Design a protein around this ligand. Sequence first.
Ligand code: CLA
Ligand code: CLA
Ligand code: CLA
Ligand code: XAT
Ligand code: SF4
Lengths: 41, 737, 218, 201
Amino acid sequence: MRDLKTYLSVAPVLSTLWFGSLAGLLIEINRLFPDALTFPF
Amino acid sequence: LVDRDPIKTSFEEWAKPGHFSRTIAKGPDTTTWIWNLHADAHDFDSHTSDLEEISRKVFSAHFGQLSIIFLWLSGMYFHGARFSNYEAWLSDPTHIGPSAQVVWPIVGQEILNGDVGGGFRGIQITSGFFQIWRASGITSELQLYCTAIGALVFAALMLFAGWFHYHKAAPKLAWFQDVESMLNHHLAGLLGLGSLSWAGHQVHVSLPINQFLNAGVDPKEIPLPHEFILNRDLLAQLYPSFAEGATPFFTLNWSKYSEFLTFRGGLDPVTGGLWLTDIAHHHLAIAILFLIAGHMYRTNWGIGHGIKDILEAHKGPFTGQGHKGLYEILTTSWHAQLSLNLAMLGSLTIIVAHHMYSMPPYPYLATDYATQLSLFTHHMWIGGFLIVGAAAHAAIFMVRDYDPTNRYNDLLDRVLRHRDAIISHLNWVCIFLGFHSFGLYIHNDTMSALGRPQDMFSDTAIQLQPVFAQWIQNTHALAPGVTAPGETASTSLTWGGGELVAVGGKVALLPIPLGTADFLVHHIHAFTIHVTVLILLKGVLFARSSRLIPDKANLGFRFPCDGPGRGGTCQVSAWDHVFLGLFWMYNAISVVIFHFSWKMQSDVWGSISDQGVVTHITGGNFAQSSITINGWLRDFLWAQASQVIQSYGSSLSAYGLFFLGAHFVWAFSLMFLFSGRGYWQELIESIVWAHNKLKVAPATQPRALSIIQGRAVGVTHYLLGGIATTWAFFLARIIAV
Amino acid sequence: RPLWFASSQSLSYLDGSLPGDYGFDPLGLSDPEGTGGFIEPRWLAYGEIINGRFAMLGAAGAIAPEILGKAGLIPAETALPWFQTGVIPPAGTYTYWADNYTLFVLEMALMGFAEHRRLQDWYNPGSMGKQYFLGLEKGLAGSGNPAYPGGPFFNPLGFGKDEKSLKELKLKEVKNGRLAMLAILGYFIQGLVTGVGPYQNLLDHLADPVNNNVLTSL
Amino acid sequence: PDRPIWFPGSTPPEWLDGSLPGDFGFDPLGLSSDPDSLKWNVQAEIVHCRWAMLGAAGIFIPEFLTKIGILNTPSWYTAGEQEYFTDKTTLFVVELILIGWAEGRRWADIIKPGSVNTDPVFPNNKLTGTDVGYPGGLWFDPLGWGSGSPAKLKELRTKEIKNGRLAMLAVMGAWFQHIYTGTGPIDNLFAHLADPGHATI
Ligand code: CLA
Ligand code: CLA
Ligand code: CLA
Ligand SMILES: CC(/C=C/C=C(C)/C=C/[C@@]12O[C@]1(C)C[C@@H](O)CC2(C)C)=C\C=C\C=C(C)\C=C\C=C(C)\C=C\[C@@]12O[C@]1(C)C[C@@H](O)CC2(C)C
Ligand code: SF4
């Protein structure tokens, strides 16, 4: 559906999807490497 | 009367935001369009002028509300089955703190999973669901899982009904305007049958299971609820009158049912709550009363009353034509009905909050102090908000739907012709109450500071005794045996009978004395309520015109001002009177909840020893310390905030964080309240300049918030911050002690 | 025509065209004002006819095995009451050639074929006699009246050749269907309160009408 | 317009006009209302059919021969746990490279038809198929059956689609049967044939 695809490109839905994926990535990154205070490499 | 397929189900309107409005559907020239989209979303009256379409739209949204409520209930029941310690709490209610939420260990937040007893680690809940489930006879988690599944199914059913009654078969306007049938059905069927069904459940399920639990039986050894139905011998062993069946009911030999239908009064010593037999009898009587009351209004069979006929016959020498014409107003305007229902529901919520603390209806609820405090505060806030909404929608009706040429009413016309006298009298009453209530606190502070304690208004120097309330307490304490011969004990323990109920080493309830401090605090309550009623009633009565702006009705319900002329006209609309009354409602409710908390912690709640001596939480300092503002600052706010400020490093650190977060949010609101739009619009012009320099200027021109939007943001943030601060303070104080 | 609890509202639309019409509609459920959804005169008449036919099939079926058991013609292990034949396993169960939940799926599928074809003919008259269906679409064309399809399949003997006879037979069908619905409700609530089959209930009433009665059963 | 329909007596969707092989008017949700989605979905269905037919053969023919005892191969469910001549990740990477080259050229033919019909190394060699998803030539149609009259083609292309759909259903069935009953698919068939009344879910 073209209209359904248009509704998925509206600002709030796109922002929600982007921020959900971003939060998931950050949570997993902090889960794999906990308590980072310095960049050791 | 319905219409078949009035509106097509399609995704086309989803891709065109603002389709409900002609102005909004054009396109976003500026950023004000985005804000305009959300503010006007649910104003169905502005969308179309057809009453049938508005009614059809209103009917379907309530189905979505019911679906959301059912989803919330399903979640609440599911979390108790999967992530709770209910079965351990059921074996030792007095030593285990209820908990139904657990947290994932990610960034060190697993510290919030503190111990609560029963080999469980989680967040302690204060909603009181455990007592509700215990009073229903629920024993295992299988029943809770089934209830959650059923609630999910009901949510799906509600959503389908909402879709159907709008897209497939939408009722006609004549169906909605049948108020007699709606009243008859909502009285006889919705309320009476529901009460009868709950009485039947309490008779057949709650009473035997709760008797077995109170006897001390292991919950896993109690027979299942259906065993009491298939095996009448078990119920006969528990209640011998069940051996006679329903024969006493039909022979009018009702006295045989006295074993499980009582009129005892008071509290159950084992659990500290009301007797369940009294509750079953109460629900039976209420069901009978509501079933009879549902046969009053006339319908297709000619017998009954006509509401218009009743209204037209009530008139007097002081009121002229009386209530004639009110039937047509209340059957053509949605806003007036909404205002009336909002006011009544808010008053009912406040009454419920007052009643549930003095007559604890659930087992092991009185000795759970945190649950009591939370429920009281929650329902007080809900009632206040609903009451303010009532006045808001009354003003909306006055602005929009008032039309004397076709909807004349004499009672409303006469009120509008002497509004100056009403407003002036209310102004004088507010000033008098403020002078003679708060002034007595300042006198006490000055006399205490000057070193003259013998000149204070107190129980030791100058007594102001509330003799009217003490007389009522004495009358209610002596009611059994004189004016209520059928009762065994008083309705509540607070009237002053002299008896004490203690459950598990804690005090459940006992008589509450009244003195000089109660007089002052009650008059403070009266003053605040009167001021709020002044701001809201002035706002409603002057919505259409005044001596300042004769044509105020042409400018609408929600407009900012009428310019700097006439010396200045900021905040003249009826919307601004609701904006100003929200702040006074907040003030009044805060004072009320502070009074409740301090009085309960000082004079009621405490621990009881073997010899029978009571040690209250704060040691009874309310009588002598609350008569000054310094006392409230020192012995209430300073002393009782030590729990929330020392919660770091423990399971209560979330409340400590929320304390500071809510402080920040409250302080952040003052930027929007103390400033005006022109400054921020001028400031944005300079910021836009540098975006043009780097070719990053948006095509949607940035605009500052409107005058009304700024006012709304300020009040919303102000209320959120204040209420959240008080919430965190209360919970952190009461969970620890 | 004879009338039975008729009213001024009900007689304004019940003019006697339908078979077995006596003007009885106290609640006005068939009022042609604003028909929609499932509350519609045509759908209500069709539902009454279908429910009557199904109840007539059920009313004799729920009692036929029981009477033959007491008559000593069928084995006693099959002379069960209708509520202990596998309908309600808590009340009792009988072991068939397949487990009950397996038979349910087959019944569901066959009944789905039949009922979906019936519904699709109701929606679009004469549509079921168009697409190839094993060569059986030649006789499943219907007749334009959904409740009375006729044809070589549903009217094999060719009864009701004359229109007057057809009207009389439709009236008889309606009367018998209503009586069968009443009998089925009696089946249910008799089984609820006496806990034993309806044929044994009748024999109990015949044995002694005063000691075996509602006054003694409730 | 008079073709058999999935729901006799109903009306087929407007975008399904009967021009495609294997078309019965089944699209209640309208997932292919627009032409681009229609083409993409057709290509996805054709690829899913061809992989599912290879998978169904590979799951069922080996397992049957093991039961009658001719071969001794392990269960298809646990075939990924045996130890081969190298670690599984290396095999996965080799697979990824080869199938990336294979599928990458298939992507360009969907976007721009007839642009990848020439051999990059030996330009004397070509694919002959005119239709997207039916590549032809000596590599994919060595017997030359893949071209003919529209009657010869609409039958063969409909036979392919009807077989592929059945294979997809069978493969998912085998997966869920092994998940639930915990035994190879052929044992389930023999159990059902032993006691059809009771050898059931
Ligand atoms: C049953 C209750 C009820 C109902 C049906 C209505 C219905 C209505 N009210 Mg109303 N109202 C109510 C109670 C109710 N009210 C109460 C109790 C109050 C007093 C507080 C008001 C005060 C009020 C005012 C002051 C106005 C209305 C207006 C309206 C009309 C338009 C509403 C609209 O567009 O909403 C739009 C909805 C929103 C903009 C959502 C607001 C969100 C809140 C404020 C913040 C929530 C914070 C949240 C937790 C943060 C998460 C954010 C997320 C994005 C992350 C509509 C007929 C308006 C009207 O008629 O104008 C002519 C109007 O001006 N009402
Ligand atoms: C703490 C600050 C504060 C104080 C003291 C007041 C006080 C008052 N407000 Mg108010 N208000 C406030 C903040 C405050 N407001 C805020 C923040 C808002 C939100 C914008 C409002 C919004 C508001 C509205 C909307 C209305 C009021 C009204 C009133 C008056 C109520 C009638 C009355 O007599 O009360 C009692 C008066 C007092 C308690 C003040 C006297 C203080 C004591 C008695 C000292 C007396 C000293 C004595 C006279 C000797 C002094 C002599 C000198 C030489 C030293 C009262 C004067 C209403 C009004 O106009 O009157 C009806 C009204 O409609 N207020
Ligand atoms: C791509 C978008 C974009 C870009 C390149 C800039 C660039 C700039 N902004 Mg800015 N700004 C933006 C969006 C953007 N802004 C938005 C959406 C807002 C409203 C919240 C602001 C509000 C803002 C203020 C109030 C100020 C600036 C200022 C500045 C300048 C100082 C550098 C800086 O980081 O300031 C800090 C900028 C921010 C903190 C903005 C927040 C960042 C937002 C969230 C990024 C949004 C990106 C957007 C969603 C792009 C989507 C891409 C997608 C469609 C592909 C710099 C030229 C300053 C200046 O020099 O004054 C002229 C200044 O005082 N901006
Ligand atoms: C897609 C699929 C299911 C399809 C779903 C359908 C019908 C949806 C239909 C609809 O959309 C329509 C049409 C129209 C819409 O309006 C409505 C809906 C209803 C939404 C199944 C399988 C899809 C895909 C399949 C079958 C995949 C095959 C897997 C293979 C090849 C496995 C191979 C191996 O097994 C071997 C050979 C040997 C082993 O050792 C190793 C492995 C690797 C395991
Ligand atoms: S713009 Fe502001 S200050 Fe000026 S009249 Fe309007 S509300 Fe008052």
